[PDB]
Amino acid sequence: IKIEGDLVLGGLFPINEKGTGTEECGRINEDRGIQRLEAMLFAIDEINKDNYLLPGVKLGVHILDTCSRDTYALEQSLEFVRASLTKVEQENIPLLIAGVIGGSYSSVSIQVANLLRLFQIPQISYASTSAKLSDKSRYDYFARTVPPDFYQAKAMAEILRFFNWTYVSTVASEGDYGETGIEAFEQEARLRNICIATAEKVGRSNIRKSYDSVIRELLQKPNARVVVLFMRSDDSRELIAAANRVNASFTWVASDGWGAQESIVKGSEHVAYGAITLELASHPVRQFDRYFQSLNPYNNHRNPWFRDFWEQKFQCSLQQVCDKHLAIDSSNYEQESKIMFVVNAVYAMAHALHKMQRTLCPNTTKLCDAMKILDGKKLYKEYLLKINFTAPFNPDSIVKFDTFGDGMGRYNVFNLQYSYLKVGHWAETLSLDVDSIHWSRNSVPTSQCSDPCAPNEMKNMQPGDVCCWICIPCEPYEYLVDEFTCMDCGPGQWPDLSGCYNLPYKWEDAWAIGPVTIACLGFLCTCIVITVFIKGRELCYILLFGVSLSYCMTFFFIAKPSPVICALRRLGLGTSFAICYSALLTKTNCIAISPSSQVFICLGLILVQIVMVSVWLILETPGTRRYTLPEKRETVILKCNVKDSSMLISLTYDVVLVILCTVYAFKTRKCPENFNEAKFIGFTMYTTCIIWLAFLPIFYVTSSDYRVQTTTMCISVSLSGFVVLGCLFAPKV
Amino acid sequence: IKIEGDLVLGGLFPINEKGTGTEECGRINEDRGIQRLEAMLFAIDEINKDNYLLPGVKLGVHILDTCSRDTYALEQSLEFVRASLTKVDQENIPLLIAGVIGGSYSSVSIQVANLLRLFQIPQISYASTSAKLSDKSRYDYFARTVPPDFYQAKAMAEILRFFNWTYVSTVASEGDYGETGIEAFEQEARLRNICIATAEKVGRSNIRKSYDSVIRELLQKPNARVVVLFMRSDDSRELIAAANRVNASFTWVASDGWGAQESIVKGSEHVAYGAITLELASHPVRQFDRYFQSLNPYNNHRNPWFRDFWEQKFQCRQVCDKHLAIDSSNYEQESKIMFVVNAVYAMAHALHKMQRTLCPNTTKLCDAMKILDGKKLYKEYLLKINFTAPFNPNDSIVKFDTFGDGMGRYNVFNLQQYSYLKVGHWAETLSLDVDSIHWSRNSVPTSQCSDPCAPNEMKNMQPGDVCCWICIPCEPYEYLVDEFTCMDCGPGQWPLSGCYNLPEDYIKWEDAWAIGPVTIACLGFLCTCIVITVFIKGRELCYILLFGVSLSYCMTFFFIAKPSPVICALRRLGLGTSFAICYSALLTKTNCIAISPSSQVFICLGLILVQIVMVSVWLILETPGTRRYTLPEKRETVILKCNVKDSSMLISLTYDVVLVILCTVYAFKTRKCPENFNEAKFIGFTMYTTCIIWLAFLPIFYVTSSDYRVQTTTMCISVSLSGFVVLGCLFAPKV
Numbered sequence A: 001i002k003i004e005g006d007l008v009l010g011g012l013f014p015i016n017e018k019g020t021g022t023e024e025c026g027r028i029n030e031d032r033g034i035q036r037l038e039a040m041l042f043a044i045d046e047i048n049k050d051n052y053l054l055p056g057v058k059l060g061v062h063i064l065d066t067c068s069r070d071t072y073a074l075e076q077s078l079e080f081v082r083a084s085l086t087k088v089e090q091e092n093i094p095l096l097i098a099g100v101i102g103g104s105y106s107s108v109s110i111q112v113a114n115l116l117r118l119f120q121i122p123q124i125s126y127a128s129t130s131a132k133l134s135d136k137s138r139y140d141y142f143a144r145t146v147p148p149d150f151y152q153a154k155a156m157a158e159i160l161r162f163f164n165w166t167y168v169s170t171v172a173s174e175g176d177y178g179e180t181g182i183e184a185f186e187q188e189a190r191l192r193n194i195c196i197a198t199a200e201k202v203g204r205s206n207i208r209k210s211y212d213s214v215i216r217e218l219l220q221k222p223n224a225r226v227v228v229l230f231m232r233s234d235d236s237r238e239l240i241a242a243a244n245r246v247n248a249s250f251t252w253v254a255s256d257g258w259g260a261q262e263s264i265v266k267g268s269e270h271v272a273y274g275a276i277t278l279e280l281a282s283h284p285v286r287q288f289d290r291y292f293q294s295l296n297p298y299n300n301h302r303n304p305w306f307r308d309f310w311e312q313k314f315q316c317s318l319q320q321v322c323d324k325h326l327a328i329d330s331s332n333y334e335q336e337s338k339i340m341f342v343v344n345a346v347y348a349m350a351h352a353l354h355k356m357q358r359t360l361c362p363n364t365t366k367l368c369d370a371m372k373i374l375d376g377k378k379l380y381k382e383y384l385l386k387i388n389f390t391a392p393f394n395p396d397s398i399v400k401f402d403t404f405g406d407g408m409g410r411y412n413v414f415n416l417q418y419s420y421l422k423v424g425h426w427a428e429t430l431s432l433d434v435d436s437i438h439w440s441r442n443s444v445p446t447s448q449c450s451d452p453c454a455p456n457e458m459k460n461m462q463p464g465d466v467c468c469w470i471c472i473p474c475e476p477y478e479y480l481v482d483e484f485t486c487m488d489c490g491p492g493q494w495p496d497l498s499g500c501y502n503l504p505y506k507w508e509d510a511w512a513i514g515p516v517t518i519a520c521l522g523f524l525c526t527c528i529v530i531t532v533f534i535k536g537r538e539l540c541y542i543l544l545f546g547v548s549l550s551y552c553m554t555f556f557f558i559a560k561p562s563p564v565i566c567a568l569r570r571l572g573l574g575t576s577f578a579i580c581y582s583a584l585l586t587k588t589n590c591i592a593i594s595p596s597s598q599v600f601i602c603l604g605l606i607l608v609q610i611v612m613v614s615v616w617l618i619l620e621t622p623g624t625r626r627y628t629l630p631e632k633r634e635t636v637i638l639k640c641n642v643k644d645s646s647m648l649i650s651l652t653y654d655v656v657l658v659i660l661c662t663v664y665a666f667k668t669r670k671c672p673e674n675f676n677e678a679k680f681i682g683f684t685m686y687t688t689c690i691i692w693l694a695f696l697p698i699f700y701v702t703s704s705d706y707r708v709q710t711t712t713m714c715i716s717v718s719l720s721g722f723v724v725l726g727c728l729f730a731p732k733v
Numbered sequence B: 001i002k003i004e005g006d007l008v009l010g011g012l013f014p015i016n017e018k019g020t021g022t023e024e025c026g027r028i029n030e031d032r033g034i035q036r037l038e039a040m041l042f043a044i045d046e047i048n049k050d051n052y053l054l055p056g057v058k059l060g061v062h063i064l065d066t067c068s069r070d071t072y073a074l075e076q077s078l079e080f081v082r083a084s085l086t087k088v089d090q091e092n093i094p095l096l097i098a099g100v101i102g103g104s105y106s107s108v109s110i111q112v113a114n115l116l117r118l119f120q121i122p123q124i125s126y127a128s129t130s131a132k133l134s135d136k137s138r139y140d141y142f143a144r145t146v147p148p149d150f151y152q153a154k155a156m157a158e159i160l161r162f163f164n165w166t167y168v169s170t171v172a173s174e175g176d177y178g179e180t181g182i183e184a185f186e187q188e189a190r191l192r193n194i195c196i197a198t199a200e201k202v203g204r205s206n207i208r209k210s211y212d213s214v215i216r217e218l219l220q221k222p223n224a225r226v227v228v229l230f231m232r233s234d235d236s237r238e239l240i241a242a243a244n245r246v247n248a249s250f251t252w253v254a255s256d257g258w259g260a261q262e263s264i265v266k267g268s269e270h271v272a273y274g275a276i277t278l279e280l281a282s283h284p285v286r287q288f289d290r291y292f293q294s295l296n297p298y299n300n301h302r303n304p305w306f307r308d309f310w311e312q313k314f315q316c317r318q319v320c321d322k323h324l325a326i327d328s329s330n331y332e333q334e335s336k337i338m339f340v341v342n343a344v345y346a347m348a349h350a351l352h353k354m355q356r357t358l359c360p361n362t363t364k365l366c367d368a369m370k371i372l373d374g375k376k377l378y379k380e381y382l383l384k385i386n387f388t389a390p391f392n393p394n395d396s397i398v399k400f401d402t403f404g405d406g407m408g409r410y411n412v413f414n415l416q417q418y419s420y421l422k423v424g425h426w427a428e429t430l431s432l433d434v435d436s437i438h439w440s441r442n443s444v445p446t447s448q449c450s451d452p453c454a455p456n457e458m459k460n461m462q463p464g465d466v467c468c469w470i471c472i473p474c475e476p477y478e479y480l481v482d483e484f485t486c487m488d489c490g491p492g493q494w495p496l497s498g499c500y501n502l503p504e505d506y507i508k509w510e511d512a513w514a515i516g517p518v519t520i521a522c523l524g525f526l527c528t529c530i531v532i533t534v535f536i537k538g539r540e541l542c543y544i545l546l547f548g549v550s551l552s553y554c555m556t557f558f559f560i561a562k563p564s565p566v567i568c569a570l571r572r573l574g575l576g577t578s579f580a581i582c583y584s585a586l587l588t589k590t591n592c593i594a595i596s597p598s599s600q601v602f603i604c605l606g607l608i609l610v611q612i613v614m615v616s617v618w619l620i621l622e623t624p625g626t627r628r629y630t631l632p633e634k635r636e637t638v639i640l641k642c643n644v645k646d647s648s649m650l651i652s653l654t655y656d657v658v659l660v661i662l663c664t665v666y667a668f669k670t671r672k673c674p675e676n677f678n679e680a681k682f683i684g685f686t687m688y689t690t691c692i693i694w695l696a697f698l699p700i701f702y703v704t705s706s707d708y709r710v711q712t713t714t715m716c717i718s719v720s721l722s723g724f725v726v727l728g729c730l731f732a733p734k735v
């Protein structure tokens, strides 16, 4: 079929089928081929009768059969290039085409785009939506009015973005459709870190058991109850048939391969209930229907295949039975989905050629001599890819091409409810209705590999993928810091984005106030005793100083603990014992080496005590520390030093020397004069005994109660010094 | 031209070069045209005459002019597909072809390989050296006998590293050659760690100053004398002409655009000595020369261009009308004829082998041959071929890589005095003899940068080019860790890390101080012990003063030992103990002769508590640790020091000295008791010692804080003499 015109247009419509082997062109296609072919013929007549597009130049066509085959399209397409650039003894003269409209299947549009790119002929495919046609490095002279396939994958995740579904499983088809879609999906899905569970490439209707094995691999991940489908129409039907076979409930999200066909869900409506699906955002062309209804072989001689179309549609073999005045009516007719895309493709060239005509031939309206040869590169790059016009007969319906010659990406969101229902649409903003969904509203799923986590449970190890975090609750001693690590805070400020580890000061009333009164009571008695003016007399006054010194340490011991306090307290305990013990061993070994032994005895006793203190300070550092096993215990200091390695040894050594001296002071004194003094020395042994008893059990065994374990033993031996203070009223009044 | 045969072959040669846009073609090519065309036609006449290669089938041809234009090639090559695959239904009867041998130019071969790709028909190109033909995602029905250009970028870069040249410049042409050539050079140069000084694109048809500016840029990096070139012949022809103008002495390593052509240097032969230029290795076909001699318009009816070629080569026939022929004087075999014959034979063997499988029963064209599977012929038989090149005695085996490319075989040339000389070749291992190069003889160039960089001068400044740097040494007493940073590690360690400040030793032991200081401390203690060991019997106060002074002497002896966290406290106590012990004894003796005279121990003990309270505040102010004073240029500092600064020595010593000064003034002026001459003389002796000690104590130790020679003995000797001063006062009262 060729129609004479000043600027003829190409056309490659799959009128026939792939046939059987040598029979390359079998039964003729009736919805994809004839409806789209007559759509372009309808569009061309509209352009010719139009007065604002190509009003002087008449637009012709050169339409050809693709036969839905790659090689057959190439041989047919040679009749396009043979006219334009083949400038080599008039019949069947070919006309210089401006550009082609053909290419329905992406397979045949690629093989044509690879040919016309060499001869500078623009191509617009009305239906081919393959992804590999969007790289202008190869198919530079190519455009299309349908969005590419990977726009679906970008639109697919939008629902996953809008419905918060993350842990998803995907199944793709063995063909190119899906093996370029799920690859495009995975790259785009992970943009919001969509949490892909699995990925299965079901065979092209290989075996029924394959679909079952897929379902086995699907239900084994119950945390992913939203499954995304990019399968073709044939495979999609067989999968859900297997799903109904084993009653595998799911929430399928499927592409235009599912579309909005009732044939897919025929006999398995219940299993696929509530599935969200997409299809091309088509729009019926009302005017085309009226034109198509008014067709019959009596008045339509342009189409050579129309005779077979009448025979195949209205069944008519050699027996003719088709002899009848019947026409084509809505009873037996269906405007094909991509008819609006076919008529848009033609009007893309008409507008591209009209704008180019208005510039290259500005004064005139017909085809001026400047277009006797058409510049293919200029027409495509400078006029086709930069076009903007509302779609004819369809009052967002504006036609344009992106930088890759692909059309604007509109879609319609269809949910299975049994009938499909448009639940919104996606062009660039997913403006679907949150309601009106059936199995995604009442049983609205939220597919995650793991549950959300409370502040107690932070530490995640992600046993599965990165998006399968499992939170274990860090202990209060460990504390909860962040979802990837548990931090600490120490003392106070219990956790915020930080846990709490250990972090290490006791104002008592009875125990705390008791030492002050005891020290004050001793000070008053010492002052009263020292206030006498009667006359080892100085030793007793010095001994009273040690008792006063011991009381002062207790008063200082009532304040907040300090590392130097333990060292000072250690000196105070030794000094207090030395002061009391030094005075006792005076005027004793009289009756019973050198005559001048009092100075040596006094010097030796003081030197021994200083040696122990100096050794303890040089060997051991009197620091500060807090003793607590639990990490949630009070953040206060418990033991400044060890108190056992050195404090226990040092404390025991001081008491032992004093205890032995007190016992031996009266055990074998051998001095009967002043027997009252001997009894007092012997009776003073019990004063030191109470301190040892109150000191060992205080912190040796069961010393956890630091409130009274340490404070209780502070004043344990603070009352021994009052025994000999008042023993003076008997001799003198 | 068409030759009927069993399996005719396509033919694409640039018979006519682009004369003008007015003419479809213009004038006729001579060397890339008829010479190459007759090479294919010669090979075909040889294969048919052959019996061991396609014996049962007659191999025809279908040769067409490419007009050296892409668009013309497409229309011509369209005659190939119109026969084989376009079988859809008598003048100009076409016949199926098994492939084409064509695509001399890269641009022509690309467009043809694009169209022939669609129809599953193999193509072999005999001269299309281009890098973008080696991707099989676009041109998968396309092989090559010649290597691609980017193998040169490998070869010459392999030349640079073999001579250790690392700092290099580059100049490249505008168009496809060079721009994709130097890009491949850069990827390989960084592979062998070769850095580029400057990169200058040079315009194709531009005024001379553009070339002059390039040379001026080249001189900006004298450290890079070796420079790489990739421009085609005409640009390199007069770039060195501009080099002779400025008289810029470089050594040039250049691509096949330069080649072994005298026309490049003709005019500026002097400037471009010792250049290293690569050329494709192509041994001439002797049989073709003999065949080409016997070619005249009378015996050449196949060629429809030979008559035009005859009138063009000899300028004839039109006017000459002479019986002349082609001989060795007016003819030289073109440099690509080896590849044209190889290209035909590659398809001939591929057809031959793929005939031994499809028709093994016979030798003729069986029914399985009626339609040839192009994909099967290319991938299964064409790419997997291996045969020695005909007419060339041998390493001449023809094969195709995974991208259908002939293996790189370049000849390394060199200008010499002028003529070129094959100084080596690059098949796969660069094999050239260094002894036979013009500039490599006289001062073989070594174009490097500050690359040799000793660890001493570890630091790198990198002022300009990133590959270059400046090696200088970091601080000898500071960090020196690497060429990017010089971090400190500490005086305890050593400087390639570089140590600046850290804990170190602080010993204060010397040969002179080891024997002197030890004996001095022992002598003072021994003298006091001897003077105290008396069994004769107010000596108690003197004994306490001796004990107080003796303790200070022991502190000085222990002061020569190692430091500790409590050494500062002990040192403060020692100074107070000696002064308190000495001062305490004097006060009791004075109060003995001149509120009752019974409070003596309390006065002596009070000073110790006062010193302890001051020590406690000083200890509370800071622990008596160590101070690693290293203010001067000496690395680190001596660990021997006090926890606090010199204020404790001065302020703390000032308080103790003030008490001694008051006692000397109180005893000297406020005495008012001339009696007790033995006590007054001893009291006067103590006052004199106190004044002498103060003069030699404060300033002596106030300036030797840094040096250990003065500060080490500034304190031990300051108080040591005081102990000996009062040591002998006891013997005076006796006999």
Ligand SMILES: N[C@](CC1c2ccccc2Oc2ccccc21)(C(=O)O)[C@H]1C[C@@H]1C(=O)O
Residues within 6 Å of the ligand: A032, A104, A105, A106, A107, A127, A128, A129, A130, A131, A149, A176, A177, A231, A232, A233, A256, A257, A338
């Ligand atoms: N849109 C189609 C088909 C589209 C597709 C695109 C690329 C690869 C495979 C592929 O197969 C499927 C399968 C299911 C759904 C849509 C496709 C095109 O070829 O572009 C074209 C038939 C449509 C028409 O004639 O209107």
Ligand SMILES: N[C@](CC1c2ccccc2Oc2ccccc21)(C(=O)O)[C@H]1C[C@@H]1C(=O)O
Residues within 6 Å of the ligand: B032, B104, B105, B106, B107, B127, B128, B129, B130, B149, B176, B177, B231, B232, B233, B256, B257, B336
């Ligand atoms: N080898 C050539 C030419 C090659 C080249 C390749 C790509 C782009 C530019 C370009 O120009 C230069 C310049 C200098 C040296 C070699 C080339 C090819 O086209 O491959 C082919 C003409 C040679 C023949 O033998 O007819």
